[PDB]
Design a protein around this ligand. Sequence first.
Ligand code: 69Y
Ligand code: 69Y
Lengths: 190, 186
Amino acid sequence: SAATREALITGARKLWGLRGYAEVGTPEIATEAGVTRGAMYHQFADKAALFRDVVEVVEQDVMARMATLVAASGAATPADAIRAAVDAWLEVSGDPEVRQLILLDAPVVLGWAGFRDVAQRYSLGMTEQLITEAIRAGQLARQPVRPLAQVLIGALDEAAMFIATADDPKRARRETRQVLRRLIDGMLNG
Amino acid sequence: SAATREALITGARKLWGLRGYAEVGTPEIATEAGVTRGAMYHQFADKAALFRDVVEVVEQDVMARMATLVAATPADAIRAAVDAWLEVSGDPEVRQLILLDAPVVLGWAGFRDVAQRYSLGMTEQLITEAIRAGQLARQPVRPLAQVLIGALDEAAMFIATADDPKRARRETRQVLRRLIDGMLNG
Ligand SMILES: O=C(CCC(F)(F)F)N1CCC2(CC1)CC(c1ccccc1)=NO2
Ligand SMILES: O=C(CCC(F)(F)F)N1CCC2(CC1)CC(c1ccccc1)=NO2
């Protein structure tokens, strides 16, 4: 039953990641997972409840992958870490599974309140940390941390959404990246 | 029947603006508007369809109010547009219908679609003129517009639900002024 929970999250994540929430039902997910409908329904009351758990694990991975790519950049100063985090988010957003589940399905299925709540829970802390360190190093002017975090999260989430539905995503990714890099380079002292 | 549409949009806008979408039903709106439920349902199949039309009219007005406040260099217009948006988003009716109810009722796809349809043109124009005047580096116009709209919408949402909106408006204003002053040349 713990095993059943895990198999259901993994199967849902894989299938919904490829085909989207709308295109795969709970019976096909149960078959994929090798469990009965009665065991599925004991763990998840409906389609949407399984999807909320798929979103948590995917967002968990998005954040761990973000932290990995910033560490991998070899950013010495906070300013460079900030530059590396921007690039990392555009990299990770571009992953087809992240695009489908987080950018496209999640806002529709969780609704706005649910989606914002999740997106804040996973993003705010990293965002505030990067800012706080840049301020401590003197690479960013002292200013209210939470409001700047919030503004950057809005800018970066919107970037990702814009690329996700672009006629030409490779162009939109490059252009949006340049525009973010310029904005950041005008804010940062170093 | 255009008249019935107008009466219904005004009544909806007034009542939902005071009490919020969730707290007022369509029958009370029909009574407010001076029409029968049958005439309302001929024009709007449900609650949400009336709300989409309330959003259009309100956003139309938000944009005209924005253009009015700016017209009262391109770089300064950009700074004035930021102030103007914080001014007009602070309006209780705009706060309730556009910042709070619209993303819930339209969804994010619908909300972004509306917000871009009304905002993009002004946003692209301000950018383009700042580029022409040499106050902003030449760079892709649509992607910058898009990023600014996201930042500014999120600013307004942050203020709209702040524990202390007067504090959050001042702090967020400073943070937006800094962001903008880094985007602009001088
Ligand atoms: O998980 C999300 C969003 C999930 C969504 F559901 F809303 F779409 N992220 C966006 C913002 C972050 C974290 C990843 C923070 C960040 C950063 C970069 C530079 C300086 C400060 C923060 N890069 O991306
Ligand atoms: O209509 C909206 C949002 C409506 C909502 F539905 F999303 F809530 N606005 C935000 C963007 C604008 C217009 C107001 C454009 C703008 C600006 C400022 C500086 C340089 C360039 C553009 N400031 O506010």
